């Protein structure tokens, strides 16, 4: 069953990939903002991705990783892939 995750869980899991006194306050919004904009490259970002992949049992496609500028689009990607996994 496709268990679509919420934006709350995503927010929290994005924090786990950094530490404590090295991150910003993910509050208000983080969906219409960029990853470069929040001090995330790719490496630390894939850690966040794998955090979710392993939990829901998914796998992120390679070409499609270059289609997410915003967390907004990343959420659609995972939500959509879940829907096709049934
Ligand atoms: P950054 O430093 O540009 O990239 C992080 C990775 C982990 C890819 C780093 O370059 C590295 O050491 N890679 C070794 C091979 C590896 O782990 N590959 C992972 C699968 S292939 C990566 C495809 C991507 O381009 C993913 C990058 C990404 C993901 C999500 C949003 C934006 C960019």
Curated annotation (Swiss-Prot):
Residues 4-82 form the Carrier domain. Disulfide bonds: none annotated. The modification O-(pantetheine 4'-phosphoryl)serine is found at residue 42. It comes from the Bacteria. 4'-phosphopantetheine is transferred from CoA to a specific serine of the apo-ACP-like protein. GO terms for molecular function: acyl binding; acyl carrier activity. GO terms for cellular component: cytosol; membrane. Pathway: Antibiotic biosynthesis; actinorhodin biosynthesis. Keywords: Antibiotic biosynthesis, Phosphopantetheine, Phosphoprotein. InterPro entries: ACP-like_sf (IPR036736), PP-bd_ACP (IPR009081), Ppantetheine_attach_site (IPR006162). GO terms for biological process: antibiotic biosynthetic process; lipid A biosynthetic process. Acyl carrier protein. This is Actinorhodin polyketide synthase acyl carrier protein. It comes from Streptomyces coelicolor (strain ATCC BAA-471 / A3(2) / M145).
